[PDB]
Design a protein around this ligand. Structure first.
Ligand SMILES: [Mg+2]
Ligand SMILES: [Mg+2]
Ligand SMILES: [Mg+2]
Length: 38
RNA sequence: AUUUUACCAAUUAAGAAGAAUAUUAUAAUAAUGGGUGUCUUAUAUUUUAAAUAAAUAUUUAAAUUCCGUGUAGUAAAUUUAUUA
């Protein structure tokens, strides 16, 4: 793998096109917005 | 002795279950992919990886900048909760 789909800004979302990115967590206990609430 | 010229005018009540567990938003309590006219045994029915996502964010300041694509806990399991 030399170029990951996250480079090309490809929108892969389940509710959008039924696809999800290969390198991600299946479950996320806290989303990015909760982590940023310092 | 039979014998009426040619042309020229218009849509109005509808009758009868021949109208509904009807359409569209609305339920913060369910959820292993629904397939009935189905039905033997699976070497043959395996999808996972720290990122923005079926999880979606109460402001007008300053500042990176050949000329601002922007605002932070409100309560620490606290009642904004994806419901049928
Ligand atoms: Mg006349
Ligand atoms: Mg009728
Ligand atoms: Mg539930």
């Amino acid at each position: 793998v030399k170029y990951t789909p996250m480079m090309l800004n490809i929108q892969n979302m389940m509710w959008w096109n039924g696809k999800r990115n290969l390198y991600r967590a299946t479950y996320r206990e806290k989303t990015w917005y909760e982590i940023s609430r310092t």
